[PDB]
Design a protein around this ligand. Structure first.
Ligand SMILES: [Zn+2]
Lengths: 76, 31, 39, 125, 167, 44, 256, 40
RNA sequence: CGGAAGGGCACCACCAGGAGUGGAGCCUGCGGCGCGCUACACUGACGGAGCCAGCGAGACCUUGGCCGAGAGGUCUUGGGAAACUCCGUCGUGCUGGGGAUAGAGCAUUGUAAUUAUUGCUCUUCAACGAGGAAUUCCUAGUAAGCGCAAGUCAUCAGCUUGCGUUGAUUACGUCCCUGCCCUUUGUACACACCGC
């Protein structure tokens, strides 16, 4: 409503130390939250799979249970 | 020991500030 | 695995062409989908 | 097909899969003969069921054992459990049940943990 | 599907997951302008409009000319005429009013006597008429329809809403 | 009865069906035991 | 039997969800309760009916100091038995305790002889509380002073306010023995002072005028930092409450 | 600077006197929580 | 307020044993107190050979090839632990157990102060000769021995926590002692027993 543009200025983000450029790309918060979301998804699916393997119930019967290199490839 | 004392001091000052602002907004609403 | 077949010339480079065109179209489709997701 | 029968021996953490079929009379463990088991003292602990019951049945029977898991003593006990289970299973299946019962009686009068597993589960006081 | 089984499957659901017909816009419409409405106007009459005109003593043709400052042809459908006839003996004056050599009637092909749906469909299909009314439901539906002038009766004479050239 | 018919394994029959001097066939005493003789010496 | 345990843990999860929803409904209905004018589920099924039995057990290859401390906790509780876990896996341990029929487990962990962690588990798929216990002082650490009186002790709980405090006081209450005598001699105190609960044994006699207490037993401040729904075998069960350390108000928030 | 967690409280004579006085009050009142036996 | 009688329990008791702490060295929590680890050798040390697991899956680890005694470095690929078993050397001597300390050398890492650290080779071979007064813990896959992995909000990094491997001697009775507890109105319902 009542705000100067210099008040609305901009704030740039500084970069990795040039002496420490072996380890690259100093990570900020947007990258951190992307990484954390992907790791949370992996942990969720892994917990699901561990729960299912804990409740396998080993009497399940499904009917599907009744079943040179280029020269080698061409021959096969 | 210094950590303990500093936490105590910060909590005391925060409580005093909260009481002061509650009193100010009370005076605003009643005056 | 695929079927090992032997190719001569024009048919080989034509399959290279159709792979190129598929890759172009996949990139453009993904970019348009991302733009629509942002919108 | 060829008459075959598969059994499992299980000590502490030693699994022993045993395939038994008719054949020339060979007893092989992990691709080696049974006369070359590892600890060189418990070789008789693994000969125990053969010498208990006699050697003619094993002259008729082919046996292949493979073993995974567990230390040395645990593996030897799993091998002998798998051999006794396989032999009495083959005898129950493809020859007379009277000889099955005679074998079961001889083995369980010598040592019952030949056949059935001794899972030493805990207990509180 | 037990209730405990339902709860278990919902918990596993959360953990796992974590021809057509598009009617063309009329060629009469710059974005909301409706540039096919130039005088003399054609105005669709409704029953409540006739009755409130009788109540406030404004003439239809001449009061409408006083509103729009142009000649207006009022048109009455068969659905509206049937609603008047079914209202009947207490609105005999409204019926003799709507039956007139200048009120050019226009037919319809509808199974029913829903004047609101008749008028809404007319205006959806053509967008050359302006609608005359005083009813709130029809007002809201036509206000949602884009680019159609609404003309209500109110106060001492008619009022017109969605026309650009009101004056 | 209906629930035992449904959930049981073996055959179960219908339970029952639902003046004058009456006889009770089942007697919860050997029929030559007097009531005073059945009463204990502590409870009297 | 594995199908039994799976079915029962699923029903237990549903029952805890229902109890949470009904407790929120009770918090809603409490506003009406002041206009006109209780224990947990497992401890309700076995509140005062059956007396509990606990197994206090070491972590693994414990030092002599930790074994002394485990014996001290065994002497603090009534109906306790001491258990030396050596080469017991955790599934077989809780399986043997379930099979034996045991009300609860208390496993201890130390650091170079100084106890620091204590986890309690209620056994029919009950909750596990993980406490960090800091300021340990043992009777062995003090002196040859005699022996614990071992009578069915009285209980004292100070400054337990929130729903978390209610959960904790119910858990510890039902670890103790039910229905003590009126003139029961030793009293266990559970003081709460800013998330650091502290326990002490105290004997007391009523004097010619008042009371006079003697402090005995162990002496240590514990502090809860986890409360898991399933038993401690799982490490994948849902968490009912989890201590948050790297939050902004971490050094000011109480009962969190 | 600033800290991150509650400091573990050191036991002193004042707080242990306060605590034994609390227990004195509780016992003198004979009003303390116990797991009373279930009736019926 | 005190006693008596009857009864139960307990590796804070008895009984039978085992394994530690306290002696040396190293490490580490407390300010002298305490916890772990390695030793004091022949049920061993050393050299060859045999080989058997489980828990674990957020410029990196790597298979293979090269050279270097080793430590290591070099070029290429993708995203199977120890104790143990057998054969052999040594033999009772602080000896070859022990590896403190010291010297010399070789390589890696940071970096630039001839800086610090790590790993390897050779030489030097200290204390320790089975640990007083005392003290602790323990009854079965338990005590003890041996390694492997991971650091998943508290606690831990010469450490905590899991995991597998090898696996015993001795009680499993008694209230005699040292304690602790319960009862001294069957209250409850048959037979029996007891009867202030
Ligand atoms: Zn119509």
């Amino acid at each position: 409503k009542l705000v100067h543009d210099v008040q609305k200025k901009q704030h740039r983000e500084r970069s990795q130390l040039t002496s420490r450029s072996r380890y690259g790309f100093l990570e900020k918060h947007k990258d951190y939250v992307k990484r954390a979301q992907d790791f949370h998804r992996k942990q969720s699916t892994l917990k699901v799979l561990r729960e299912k393997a804990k409740e396998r119930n080993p009497d399940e019967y499904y009917h599907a249970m009744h079943s040179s290199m280029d020269q080698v490839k061409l021959l096969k | 020991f210094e950590a303990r004392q500093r936490i105590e001091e910060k909590n005391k000052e925060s409580s005093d500030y909260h009481a002061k602002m509650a009193h100010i907004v009370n005076t605003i609403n009643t005056e | 695995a695929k079927r090992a077949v032997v190719l001569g010339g024009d048919e080989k480079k034509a399959r290279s062409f159709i792979q190129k065109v598929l890759t172009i179209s996949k990139a453009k489709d993904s970019k348009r989908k991302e733009q629509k997701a942002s919108q | 097909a060829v008459p075959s029968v598969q059994t499992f021996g299980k000590k502490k953490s030693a699994t022993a899969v045993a395939h038994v079929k008719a054949g020339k009379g060979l007893i092989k463990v992990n691709g080696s003969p049974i006369t070359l088991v590892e600890p060189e003292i418990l070789r008789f602990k693994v000969y125990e069921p053969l010498l208990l019951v006699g050697l003619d049945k094993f002259s008729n029977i082919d046996i292949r054992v493979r073993v995974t898991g567990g230390g040395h003593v645990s593996q030897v006990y799993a091998i002998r459990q798998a051999i006794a289970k396989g032999l009495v299973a083959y005898h129950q299946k493809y020859v007379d049940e009277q000889s099955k019962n005679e074998l079961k009686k001889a083995f369980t009068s010598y040592d019952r943990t030949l056949l059935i597993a001794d899972s030493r589960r805990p207990e509180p006081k | 599907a037990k209730k405990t089984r339902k709860f278990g499957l919902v918990k596993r659901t959360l953990n796992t997951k974590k021809t057509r017909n598009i009617p063309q816009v009329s060629s009469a419409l710059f974005f909301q302008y409706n540039q096919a409405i130039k005088p003399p106007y054609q105005v669709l009459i409704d029953t409540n409009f006739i009755n409130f005109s009788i109540q406030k003593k404004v003439d239809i043709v001449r009061g409408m000319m006083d509103c729009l400052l142009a000649k207006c042809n009022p048109l009455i459908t068969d659905c509206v005429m049937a609603e008047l006839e079914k209202l009947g003996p207490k609105y005999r004056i409204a019926l003799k009013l709507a039956r007139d050599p200048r009120i050019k009637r226009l037919s319809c092909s509808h199974k029913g006597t829903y004047a609101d749906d008749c008028l809404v469909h007319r205006v959806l299909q053509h967008k050359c008429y302006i609608v005359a009314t005083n009813d709130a439901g029809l007002k809201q539906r036509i206000r949602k329809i884009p680019g159609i002038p609404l003309m209500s009766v109110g106060g001492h004479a008619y009022v017109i809403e969605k026309l650009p050239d009101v004056f | 009865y209906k629930l035992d018919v449904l959930s049981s394994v073996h055959f179960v029959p219908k339970p029952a069906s639902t003046e004058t001097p009456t006889i009770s066939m089942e007697d919860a005493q050997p029929l030559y035991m007097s009531n005073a003789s059945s009463l204990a010496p502590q409870e009297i | 039997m594995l199908r039994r345990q799976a079915r029962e843990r699923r029903e237990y999860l549903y029952r805890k969800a229902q109890e949470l929803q009904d407790s929120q409904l009770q918090q809603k209905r409490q506003i009406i309760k002041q206009a006109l004018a209780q224990v947990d589920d497992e401890y309700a099924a076995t509140s005062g009916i059956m007396d509990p039995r606990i197994i206090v057990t070491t972590s693994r290859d414990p030092s002599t100091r930790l074994s002394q401390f485990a014996k001290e906790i065994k002497l603090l509780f009534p109906n306790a038995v001491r258990l030396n876990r050596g080469n017991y896996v955790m599934p077989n341990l809780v399986d043997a305790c379930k099979k034996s029929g045991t009300t609860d487990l208390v496993v201890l962990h130390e650091h170079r002889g100084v106890p620091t962690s204590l986890t309690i588990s209620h056994f029919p798929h009950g909750p596990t509380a993980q406490f960090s216990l800091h300021n340990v002082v043992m009777r062995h650490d003090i002196i040859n002073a005699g022996n614990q009186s071992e009578v069915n002790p009285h209980l004292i709980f100070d400054n337990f306010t929130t729903a978390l405090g209610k959960r904790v006081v119910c858990i510890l209450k039902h670890l103790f023995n039910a229905g003590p005598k009126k003139d029961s001699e030793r009293v266990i105190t559970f003081a709460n002072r800013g998330d650091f609960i502290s326990v002490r044994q105290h004997v007391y006699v009523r004097t010619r005028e008042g009371v006079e207490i003697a402090e005995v037993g162990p002496r240590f401040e514990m502090r809860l930092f986890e409360l898991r729904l399933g038993t401690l075998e799982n490490k994948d069960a849902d968490v009912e409450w989890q201590l948050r350390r790297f939050i902004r108000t971490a050094n000011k928030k109480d009962y969190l | 600077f600033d800290r991150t967690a509650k400091p573990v409280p050191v036991i002193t004579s004042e707080v242990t006197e306060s605590l034994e006085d609390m227990i004195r009050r509780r016992i003198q009142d004979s009003n303390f929580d116990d797991l009373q036996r279930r009736t019926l």
